[PDB]
């Protein structure tokens, strides 16, 4: 479960999530799972999806994870008449914009890798596509 070792600040603003992604190209590998929509991967989601594609290649290959959950997210506990400060940090997220590559693979063929990233896609909340590397 991914989570920075230490930060400056425990808690962070909510922010927004507008605009398109940096990190659009498949650099590290041959293939990749590009996002098409727009949301947050939790850290549990990112892991569940790695364990799908890892299982599915039988450990051939290499897998890179391009996104990291570094925004923290608070919840108030149950019954909390509002106010009395900001809540505790429950869990961590990456924010995803349309066009971010999330996973990359090489050291398998395009038969198998399509099936691996289909099995990951079912664990993630955002709509995704398969991409191959472009030479320029």
């Amino acid at each position: 479960m991914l989570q920075p070792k230490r930060t400056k600040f425990r808690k962070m603003h909510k922010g927004r999530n507008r605009g398109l992604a940096q990190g659009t190209d498949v650099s590290f590998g041959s293939f990749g799972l590009k996002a098409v929509g727009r949301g947050r991967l939790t850290a549990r989601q990112i892991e569940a999806a790695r364990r799908a594609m890892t299982r599915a290649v039988k450990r051939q290959g290499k897998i890179w994870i391009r996104v990291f959950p570094d925004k923290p997210i608070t919840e108030k506990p149950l019954a909390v008449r509002m106010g009395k400060g900001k809540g505790n940090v429950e869990y961590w997220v990456a924010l995803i914009q349309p066009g971010k590559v999330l996973y990359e693979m090489d050291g398998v063929p395009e038969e198998l890798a399509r099936e691996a990233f289909k099995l990951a896609a079912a664990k993630l909340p955002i709509k995704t596509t398969f991409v191959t590397k472009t030479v320029m």
């Binding site: 398109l20 992604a21 659009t24 590009k34 996002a35 098409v36 349309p98 066009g99 596509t129 472009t134 030479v135 320029m136």
Partner: protein, 94 residues
Amino acid sequence: MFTINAEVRKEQGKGASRRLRAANKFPAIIYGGKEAPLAIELDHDKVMNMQAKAEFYSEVLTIVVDGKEIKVKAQDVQRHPYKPKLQHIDFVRA
């Protein structure tokens, strides 16, 4: 040999260039060597099919622009950042 037709552009800028990708064209530029840079526009489907082949980026190409052939290399290419499309190509003169 990879042949492309083109047109010189009347308009340009955000408003103009978004109207082109509505009309299945897209804008590109020819610069490099000596002269003034040139602004051009290209059928999207033609040049999508061509740039599938990896010889697009090695070879010299041949842009017809009001009769005059020009010989150019594919220097740079902006992709639309999820759908498989193109938003712009820089063509250096060779």
